[PDB]
Each structure stands twice: as structure tokens, then as C-alpha cells.
Write a protein that binds this ligand. Structure first.
Ligand code: CL
Length: 237
């Protein structure tokens, strides 16, 4: 729970921490039309800011692909909502995950309905570009045919309009956007063996902040965790 002496000294040197966030990933991370960072991960960030006493501020908006390049080039200090992959461990260090959801398969009601990953071979499978579902599939199922799209909404719209035959993504952002875009033509068709493990990451060359954040996240009360999720359970259920 407590910071060590070196962690306190590091916080002194970083009055501001540069955050890399997705502009269009509700309910986890989005920038409203005023440009303000919102979402479930933004709530965790606001709590970290209170605890750490330093300013955690998103930098200028970029595509998520660009954000990951910025973190490779050490042009960012913290990514608040990202899943670990083996490839990412080469340039990022991660907290332990603070939220965890299944990775599921969405279909059109008038279209094909794959039950598992093995019923995806032979279909055009939409995924959000450079999120972990995409990277897991490339590494573990190279012969699938994927359609990476820039946002969950773009991907669900591709599925809903027939441009994709299925979509693979995490449970929470898939259901949130299905209902908020009112795509009453889609449904959940199946399961994968994969979990979406939402964590925060820092450049692997500067691991102290992931240690600091991990300690704060692990020390959260049951009460605090409930309040952090309460604005967002509504449009999942
Ligand atoms: Cl990710």
C-alpha cells in the first residue's frame, strides 16, 4: 500500500505524467467532444492522481496505432488501458490487470454464427486494429482472415452492414457499443479461450511507475472498486 523511498523520489521528478489513451473506446477510454478524457479507465486515472499527487494528463489525440508507436519511442509515460502480449513485453512493462473480461464472438442474426475460434476459419473476422484480440489471433491462429478496423464502432458497423462476417473482441466494449449504437441486428454467437486483461503499461526502460500504480490498484477497497465501475455497468446490463 505504502510507497517505498525511491518511489516517492521519482514522483518528485514527474509533476506531470504523459498519458496515451484511445479517443474512441467506450466504455474504457474516450475523448468527449470537448476533448476531455472519459471512461472507466479515466476513473481509475483520476483516483491515481488523487493518491499520487501528480498530474496525469493525456497528450494530443492520435490513433491507437500512433499511441503505441509513441510508447515505443518513449514519448509517453503511462498507457491506462491496455492488455499485455509477449511482443509488448519487449517495450512495455505492465501492472497486473485491474479488470478482466472474456473475449467473445459477435455475429449478425441473418449471417453466420461461429461458436469457437475453429468455426472462424473461412470467414472475414473483424477486430479492432492493434488491440490484443487482434495480436493474439495473429500470433496463435495465423491462417485466419482478419479485417482490422480503427475503432469498436467501425468494426461493429462493418459487421452489421455485411462487410464482416463476425467480430472478435472483449465482452464489455462489444456489448456497450452494440447497445449504444443500437445495432439490434447483432448478437453474441460464441466464446473464445482468451481473456481480455485490462492493465496499465509504461516504457520497459522506466518500470518504476508500473510498480507504483500496481501497488495503488492492488490496495483499492471493495467500496472503491464498486464506485469506479458503477457509472458503466448500466449500459452493459
Ligand atoms: Cl489491448
Amino acid at each position: 500500500a505504502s510507497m517505498t523511498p525511491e518511489e516517492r523520489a521519482w514522483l518528485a521528478e514527474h509533476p506531470s505524467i504523459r498519458l496515451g489513451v484511445d479517443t474512441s473506446w467506450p466504455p474504457f477510454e474516450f475523448r468527449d467532444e470537448q476533448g476531455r478524457y472519459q471512461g472507466l479507465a479515466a476513473g481509475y486515472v483520476s483516483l491515481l492522481q488523487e493518491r499520487k499527487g501528480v498530474s496525469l494528463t493525456p497528450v494530443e489525440p492520435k490513433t491507437w496505432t500512433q499511441v503505441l508507436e509513441q510508447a515505443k519511442d518513449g514519448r509517453l509515460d503511462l498507457l491506462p488501458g491496455i492488455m499485455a502480449t509477449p511482443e509488448r513485453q519487449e517495450y512495455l512493462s505492465f501492472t497486473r490487470p485491474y479488470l478482466d473480461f472474456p473475449i467473445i464472438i459477435l455475429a449478425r442474426k441473418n449471417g453466420p454464427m461461429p461458436k469457437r475460434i475453429d468455426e472462424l476459419y473461412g470467414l472475414k473476422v473483424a477486430v479492432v486494429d492493434h488491440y490484443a484480440p487482434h495480436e493474439l489471433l495473429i500470433a496463435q491462429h495465423p491462417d485466419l482472415t482478419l479485417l482490422p478496423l480503427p475503432s469498436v464502432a467501425a468494426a461493429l458497423q462493418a459487421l452489421a452492414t455485411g462487410q464482416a462476417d463476425a467480430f472478435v473482441g472483449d465482452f464489455a466494449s462489444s456489448v456497450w457499443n452494440l447497445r449504444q449504437l443500437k445495432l439490434n441486428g447483432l448478437e453474441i454467437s460464441g466464446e473464445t479461450p482468451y481473456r481480455y486483461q485490462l492493465a496499465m503499461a509504461v516504457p520497459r526502460g522506466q518500470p518504476i511507475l508500473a510498480g507504483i500504480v500496481d501497488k495503488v490498484l492492488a490496495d483499492l477497497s471493495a467500496e472503491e472498486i464498486e464506485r469506479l465501475q458503477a457509472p458503466w455497468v448500466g449500459g452493459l446490463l
